[PDB]
Curated annotation (Swiss-Prot), chain B:
<dbReference type="GO" id="GO:0060038">
    <property type="term" value="P:cardiac muscle cell proliferation"/>
</dbReference>
<keyword id="KW-0325">Glycoprotein</keyword>
<feature type="binding site">
    <location>
        <begin position="107"/>
        <end position="110"/>
    </location>
    <ligand>
        <name>GTP</name>
    </ligand>
</feature>
<dbReference type="InterPro" id="IPR027417">
    <property type="entry name" value="P-loop_NTPase"/>
</dbReference>
<feature type="modified residue" description="N-acetylmethionine; in GTPase KRas; alternate">
    <location>
        <position position="1"/>
    </location>
</feature>
<keyword id="KW-0547">Nucleotide-binding</keyword>
<keyword id="KW-0564">Palmitate</keyword>
<dbReference type="GO" id="GO:0060441">
    <property type="term" value="P:epithelial tube branching involved in lung morphogenesis"/>
</dbReference>
<keyword id="KW-0656">Proto-oncogene</keyword>
Swiss-Prot record, chain C:
<dbReference type="GO" id="GO:0051450">
    <property type="term" value="P:myoblast proliferation"/>
</dbReference>
<keyword id="KW-0963">Cytoplasm</keyword>
<dbReference type="GO" id="GO:0060441">
    <property type="term" value="P:epithelial tube branching involved in lung morphogenesis"/>
</dbReference>
<dbReference type="GO" id="GO:0000165">
    <property type="term" value="P:MAPK cascade"/>
</dbReference>
<dbReference type="GO" id="GO:0030275">
    <property type="term" value="F:LRR domain binding"/>
</dbReference>
<keyword id="KW-0378">Hydrolase</keyword>
<dbReference type="GO" id="GO:0019221">
    <property type="term" value="P:cytokine-mediated signaling pathway"/>
</dbReference>
<comment type="similarity">
    <text>Belongs to the small GTPase superfamily. Ras family.</text>
</comment>
<dbReference type="GO" id="GO:0051385">
    <property type="term" value="P:response to mineralocorticoid"/>
</dbReference>
Amino acid sequence: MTEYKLVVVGACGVGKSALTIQLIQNHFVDEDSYRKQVVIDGETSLLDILDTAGQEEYSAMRDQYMRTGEGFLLVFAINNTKSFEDIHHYREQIKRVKDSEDVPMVLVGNKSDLPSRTVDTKQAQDLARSYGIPFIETSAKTRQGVDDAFYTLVREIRKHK
Amino acid sequence: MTEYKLVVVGACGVGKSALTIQLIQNHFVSYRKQVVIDGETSLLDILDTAGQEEYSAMRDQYMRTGEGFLLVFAINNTKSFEDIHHYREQIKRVKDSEDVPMVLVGNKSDLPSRTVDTKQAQDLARSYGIPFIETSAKTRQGVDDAFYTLVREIRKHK
Amino acid sequence: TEYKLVVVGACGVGKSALTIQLIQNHFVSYRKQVVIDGETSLLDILDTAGQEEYRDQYMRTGEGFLLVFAINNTKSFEDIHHYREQIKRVKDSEDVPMVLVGNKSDLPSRTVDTKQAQDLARSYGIPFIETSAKTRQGVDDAFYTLVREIRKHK
Ligand SMILES: Nc1nc2c(ncn2[C@@H]2O[C@H](COP(=O)(O)OP(=O)(O)O)[C@@H](O)[C@H]2O)c(=O)[nH]1
Ligand SMILES: Nc1nc2c(ncn2[C@@H]2O[C@H](COP(=O)(O)OP(=O)(O)O)[C@@H](O)[C@H]2O)c(=O)[nH]1
Ligand SMILES: Nc1nc2c(ncn2[C@@H]2O[C@H](COP(=O)(O)OP(=O)(O)O)[C@@H](O)[C@H]2O)c(=O)[nH]1
Ligand SMILES: *CCS(=O)(=O)NC1CCN(C(=O)CNc2cc(Cl)c(Cl)cc2O)CC1
């Protein structure tokens, strides 16, 4: 059976854990590792997921997951300009550790349910276009885009393989 | 607000009209509907192709006009599933693009006489890189999901 | 039970094509026995095509009116106001059964949008039905809806 090691990266507080909880546990209320078998396009897939902002205690485990991670969600929040500005850093770090220019990634703009917006959808779309990766708008609260984000990433991994 | 022109294609008798009627009128025996998808209100305009679709020239016109396509087969009609590749190839040819919003739809899911397995259809959709939704115009299973997913694919393309 | 229906609208909007599609069921004063709302009805349909504008008896006698414009003919839509006002004046009533009909819906382009027509029909307090005499889309709906409006009035 196929396993996918996924890493969810982005600034503290953008909703990485919330997105992963919604995917895996199917709830939201207002732990950084998860493991579950799902079915994606008829293929049974074990997802092994790590959420990380890059500043957590277990750096050794983080470096391991970065090296073996097959795909990455690059997450910012639409009401957090700094988190959007941080995306380039995260992508550059992944490319360095993987020593590759072809790493499966999806850009995720979370908290789309909130009326406070400081990052334009066009900004994000433009950035994702430059990187050659999909952009998905999500809300961990309403479930908007959550399956799409993770499943699109799994589809990017298959493309790569 | 944003209007999306949608075209439902597939073999005669797979339930394209039935799917449309179930979407718009919530009935199983009007082509426009306002919907909210992912927080955005949109107008679905399903092109009415009845009568005219028998002519290739008109089919070409509808394909050029449409922004996204449901590729419908019936799960108790193997030939209708086999016909899907041809229909997709015509859309790609006419719109001169290898990237056109489409969703694969396996209709009549309520029937026991299934001859097209979920796996066969999933494999096809995975190859095309498009969503696959199983539907029944009779029970309403999957009907909103099929059309709303197509809108999502159109939005991604644009 | 007889219903006297009158089809009005600018030249070339499809008044005759709609009438013939209803009666004879093909695309190019009339009577047709129909069943509507379970009731057997005799429809007397006056196609005013070619009728000279200079028909007081037909209007006063007419029980319901199809106000037809073509969705690719802005002027024909503008002309609907004329017909509406003329009929209300001549019949001397504010409650005359009418249906607004936007014909030629099969054409690939349109210059009168659905919202425009829906809003005008709302102003008038009448139904709006999009039709194609060519494909028969909406044709029965238009005439049957008018019969229903007459019944509500009666
Ligand atoms: N309204 C809203 N709040 C969210 C969303 N995602 C996360 N949150 C909230 O944002 C805060 C931080 O989320 P968290 O998952 O801990 O962020 P992380 O540090 O990236 O793992 C929490 O209070 C969450 O409930 C969302 O999509 N919408
Ligand atoms: N049992 C079942 N019958 C269906 C379904 N959808 C359509 N039908 C029937 O299939 C036949 C053809 O449907 P229709 O909408 O006319 O097909 P079209 O030619 O693709 O537009 C009709 O007898 C419908 O009642 C479905 O989901 N379940
Ligand atoms: N494409 C299309 N042409 C129509 C339709 N209805 C009428 N026509 C054409 O428009 C022209 C005028 O139709 P006609 O019935 O004579 O209009 P009238 O003057 O209002 O009675 C003719 O060439 C018809 O064939 C329709 O629904 N679609
Ligand atoms: C149901 C018999 S029919 O001859 O009237 N319609 C056929 C025509 C051939 N065909 C398709 O090409 C696939 N469906 C389809 C494609 C397009 Cl582009 C359009 Cl506009 C409409 C339809 O139905 C099957 C149905």
